[PDB]
């Protein structure tokens, strides 16, 4: 006995029962994947402006 | 062996009764009106080449008035894959039985049955299809692995059972003759027809990485560096 092999019937109906939702934008994305040479500097950059505001607000 | 078979079938001419011929990847199909026409062909094939075969059948009508159930028959023939001039490692038990021949051999004749020759110590041994198929193996290297050599001198030693055999052939590679200095010196069956300055073809075993387990069960030092298949 042979089967029925493939279809996509009812697959688009199933999909919309629960939305098809977007993945939520965030203020501040991850620096995973970003140029290492740039990050290396940006770490040291904020340490300075925090210490500048810490010494300012003392 | 198929190109040989296609030539051999024409000489004696067993074909005529076929309706048509079609082809496929690794051979070709023959179609016959009557069942008894196709059996003569297989009996003819049994005569001239090593084979294995079997028949199965398909039913169609089953007429309730007798003398015509109407069956349709299919015979599946397999030629033995070791060709005429291949380089072969035999299995250990098989090699001990057939004359105590060495495991490292060339083929000889490829007739009704397959026959082997040992290029160094001239010797011969036969292998029938029934004995092949029960424990099947494959060739180490084919006709497409041959390499061109140039013969310089032949020193004969002695024996001649039927081919003026055991010639210590001094040879050098065609890619090496011009540039580089290197010489290979090897005993060979090609004694009667070998002359200095002749181009000869052969297997050059020194640079080939095989992957046969039979070959892996060998003596990485009793094995000959160079074997020459034929003149030209």
């Amino acid at each position: 006995a042979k089967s029925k092999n493939h279809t996509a019937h009812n697959q688009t109906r199933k999909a919309h029962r629960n939305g098809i939702k977007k993945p939520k934008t965030y203020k501040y994305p991850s620096l995973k994947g970003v140029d290492p040479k740039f990050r290396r500097n940006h770490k040291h950059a904020l340490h300075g402006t925090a210490k500048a505001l810490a010494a300012a607000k003392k | 062996t198929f190109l040989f078979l296609e030539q051999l079938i024409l000489k004696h001419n067993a074909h005529v009764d076929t309706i048509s011929i079609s082809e496929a990847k690794d051979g070709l199909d023959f179609f016959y009106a009557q069942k008894n026409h196709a059996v003569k062909m297989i009996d003819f094939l049994n005569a001239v080449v090593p084979i294995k075969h079997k028949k199965s059948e398909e039913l169609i009508s089953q007429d309730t008035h007798t003398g015509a159930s109407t069956y349709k028959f299919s015979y599946s023939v397999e030629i033995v894959p070791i060709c005429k001039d291949d380089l072969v490692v035999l299995p250990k038990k098989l090699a001990k039985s057939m004359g105590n021949i060495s495991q490292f051999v060339l083929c000889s004749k490829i007739s009704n049955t397959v026959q082997f020759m040992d290029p160094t110590t001239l010797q011969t041994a036969d292998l029938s299809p029934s004995v092949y198929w029960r424990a099947p193996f494959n060739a180490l290297a084919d006709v497409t692995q041959l390499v061109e050599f140039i013969v310089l001198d032949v020193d004969s030693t002695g024996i001649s059972r039927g081919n003026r055999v055991l010639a210590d052939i001094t040879v050098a590679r065609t890619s090496d003759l011009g540039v580089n200095d290197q010489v290979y010196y090897v005993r060979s069956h090609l004694g009667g027809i070998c002359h200095a300055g002749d181009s000869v073809m052969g297997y050059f075993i020194a640079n080939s990485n095989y992957n046969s387990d039979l070959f892996d069960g060998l003596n990485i030092d009793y094995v000959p560096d160079v074997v020459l298949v034929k003149k030209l």
Binding site: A15, K21, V34, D35 | -
Partner: protein, 159 residues
């Protein structure tokens, strides 16, 4: 059997246009991309390095990284009951700025000027775009323009 290679079905897609083969023009290389910019993807066929997969042909994302000869675009791709968030590393031939965002940016300067001028003028603004409203009345003159009477024509073959 089946065949699902990395560039299957791309006979006419990565093709090079008619009378526009050969070297890419220098203004392609002299354009400066920054983190945040919107860019459309369109794979040049001549440059084999840094190429996108056939899916991202015609998609438009945001930049997130910039490096020696490439940019990081970030696209949204849909799969099932969901969107995943996908990170590309394309060379700069296969990319160009979205002119829909550049249209927007210029309107922001227009609207800020309207509000700045409205305070100096004196109250009211109404700075939203209204869609095409239904059209008003008019008196179409017949002065040197009398109506031309027409009727349906009869069938003729001409073959």
């Amino acid at each position: 059997g089946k065949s699902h290679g990395y560039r299957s079905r791309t006979r006419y897609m990565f093709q090079r246009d008619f009378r526009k083969h050969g070297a890419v023009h220098l203004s392609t290389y002299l354009k400066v991309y920054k983190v945040g910019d919107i860019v459309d993807i369109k794979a040049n066929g001549s440059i084999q390095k840094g190429m996108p997969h056939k899916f991202y042909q015609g998609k438009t994302g945001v930049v997130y990284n910039v490096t020696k000869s490439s940019v990081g675009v970030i696209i949204n791709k849909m799969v099932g009951n969901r969107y995943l968030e996908k990170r590309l590393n394309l060379r700069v031939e296969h990319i160009k700025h979205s002119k829909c965002r550049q249209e927007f940016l210029e309107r922001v300067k227009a609207n800020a000027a309207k509000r700045a001028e409205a305070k100096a003028q004196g109250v009211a603004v109404q700075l939203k775009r209204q869609p095409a409203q239904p059209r008003e009345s008019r008196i179409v003159s017949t002065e040197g323009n009398v109506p031309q009477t027409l009727a349906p024509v009869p069938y003729e073959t001409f073959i």
